[PDB]
Amino acid sequence: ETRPNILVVLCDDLGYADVGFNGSTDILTPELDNLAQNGSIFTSAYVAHPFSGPSRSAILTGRYPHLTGTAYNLFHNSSEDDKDNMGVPVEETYMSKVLQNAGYYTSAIGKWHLGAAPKFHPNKRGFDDFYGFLGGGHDYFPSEYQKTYKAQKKAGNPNIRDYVFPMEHNGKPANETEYITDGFSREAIKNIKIAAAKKQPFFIYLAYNAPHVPLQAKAEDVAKFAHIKDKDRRTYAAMVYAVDRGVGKIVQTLKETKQFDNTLIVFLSDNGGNFNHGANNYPLKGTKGDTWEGGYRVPMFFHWPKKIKKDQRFDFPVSSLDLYPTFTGLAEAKLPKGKQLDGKNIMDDVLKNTEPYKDEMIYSLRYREGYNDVGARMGDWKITRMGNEPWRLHNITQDIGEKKNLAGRYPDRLKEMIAKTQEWTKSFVKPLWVYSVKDKELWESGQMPNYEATFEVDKLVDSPYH
């Protein structure tokens, strides 16, 4: 057996400038930085959607959420009955199931957000082990949330928020006793040791909910950030530091079990930081949920000592959609018949420092209340529509903050990129669920999605009097 172990370390709402290797000056991430410095830092890494549910759907299915009907978040406490189909389609085979069928020991830890009904459960979607929670977020201290859950259960509360539900281990009570970031790190260590004892390659999907709200941190970690005056930034920094501590213990475990050299560690965020709740996306414009770069360009590194050189910087754009074909290629796994994928097996490009998306697009489209936000990048160029304002064209390599609209200078390039992006939307399916009552009314009237209006150009800038 020479196939590598694969560890995905996925943070939740981690800001672009909030790890040291991607520019942080106030948040300390020495363990993540050491891995990044000993592998490949991706300076133009994108997720397939600027917020969690659709982004995580894309990671595990390998498809844009607009093709699977999962481009809106599931609501909190979404239906746990199979009959309601509130989850990613079961026919869309996850890479975990592909790796499991190829003989990998598979483990999911932390946040799911891909369906709370039994047919959507991690154990039915290719994970031998699951430890975590099914919804979109969770309170961080068991001594707090277990007391709240128990009191509200006894009081007969019918609206108990899923943020205080007991976590689970393979459908049984987890009985967590630690700050849950530490608990997730503990379970990752355990599953690494299980794989080593089995002498089986592992795939671990470690989906920390940190630094997603609520901003809750251990006093021991907060103490290391007294140099930060803003309380939210200080708490957020401590939350990221807790992840870094866990990564350090995971690395030590990989070394002890002699799995370190032939493990591919992939670290990223599921979307941009929310700059209302502690995050910093510098030098990108915008925030979680935007199609500015700040919404869906994320930190990422690959660390794999057997193959990936130290101190590498990979500057060509890549997508979290690339993880599915890259991982199944490394696992020598056969895809299910008819499986469709929107990403690329990029490992050879990473090893050769070549451009996987040369002359091809990486996209985002985010549904708003009556219009769509869009981003589309090819090479050095990006088109952006935000707030239904006029279309922008940016040289994103020379103008990473999207400050200088070049649409008037290069109209032909703008319209070529518009045409390809519009063609992409012709492949979309209807959402299986929307998020608000407003959404439902808009889709039912045809006011959404109205892709045709999204790709208007001239009428947004022309005067009716000239």
Ligand X SMILES: O=S(=O)(O)O[C@@H]1[C@H](O[C@H]2O[C@@H]3CO[C@@H]([C@H]3O[C@@H]3O[C@H](CO)[C@H](O)[C@H](O[C@H]4O[C@@H]5CO[C@@H]([C@H]5O)[C@H]4OS(=O)(=O)O)[C@H]3O)[C@H]2OS(=O)(=O)O)[C@@H](O)[C@H](O)O[C@@H]1CO
Site of interaction with ligand X (CB under 6 A): 50-52, 73, 76, 136-137, 161, 163, 213, 274, 288-289, 408, 435
> According to the binding rule CB under 5 A, does residue 261 interact with Br ion?
yes
Q: Which of 49, 111, 125, 218 binds Br ion (CB under 5 A)?
A: 125
Site mask, Ca ion, residues 51-90, x = CB under 5 A? -x--------------------------------------
Binders in 337-366 for a second copy, by CB under 8 A = none
- DSSP strand pairing (312-314 vs 105-111): unpaired
Q: Among residue numbers 275 through 314, which ones bind a second copy (CB under 8 A)?
A: 276-277
- What number of H helices and E strands is found in the chain? 14, 17
Closest-CA residue to 334 (of 97, 88, 4): 97
339 sits near Br ion (criterion: CB under 5 A): no
How many beta carbons lie within 10 A of that of residue 300, not counting itself? 24
Q: How far is the CB of 424 from ligand X (least distance, A)?
A: 21
Report how far residue 273's alpha carbon sits from residue 184's, in angstroms, rounded to the nearest whole number: 21
Q: Residue 359's CB: how many other CB atoms inside 10 A?
A: 7
Residue 459 has which token pair? 């009428």
Q: What are 441's two structure tokens?
A: 């009314």
**Shortest Å, Cβ 159 to a second copy:** 9
**Residue 13 three-state SS:** coil
By CB under 8 A, the residues from 120 to 149 that bind a second copy are: none
Q: Does 232 bind a second copy (CB under 8 A)?
A: yes
User: To the nearest whole angstrom, how small is the minimum distance from the Cβ of residue 370 to a second copy?
Assistant: 6
Residue span 389-428 as binding mask against Cl ion, x where in contact by CB under 5 A, dash where not: ---------------------x-xx---------------
Binding mask 86-115 for a second copy (x = CB under 8 A): x-----------------------------
- For residues 18 and 27, the answer to whether their CB atoms sit within 8 Å is yes
Answer for the pair 287, 293: CB distance below 8 angstroms, yes or no. no
From Cl ion, ligand X, Ca ion, none, which one binds at residue 408 (CB under 5 to 8 Å depending on kind)? ligand X
Closer residue to ligand X in complex, CB, 126/289: 289
CB of 170 to ligand X, least distance (A): 23
C-alpha neighbours within 13 Å on the C-beta side of residue 354: 10
Let me know if 313 is exposed, middle or buried by CB neighbors in 10 A (0-12, 13-18, 19+). Answer: exposed
Asked if residues 253 and 189 have their Cβ atoms less than 8 Å apart, the reply is yes
Q: Which option in Br ion, Cl ion, Ca ion, none does residue 94 bind, with CB closer than 5 to 8 A by kind?
A: Br ion
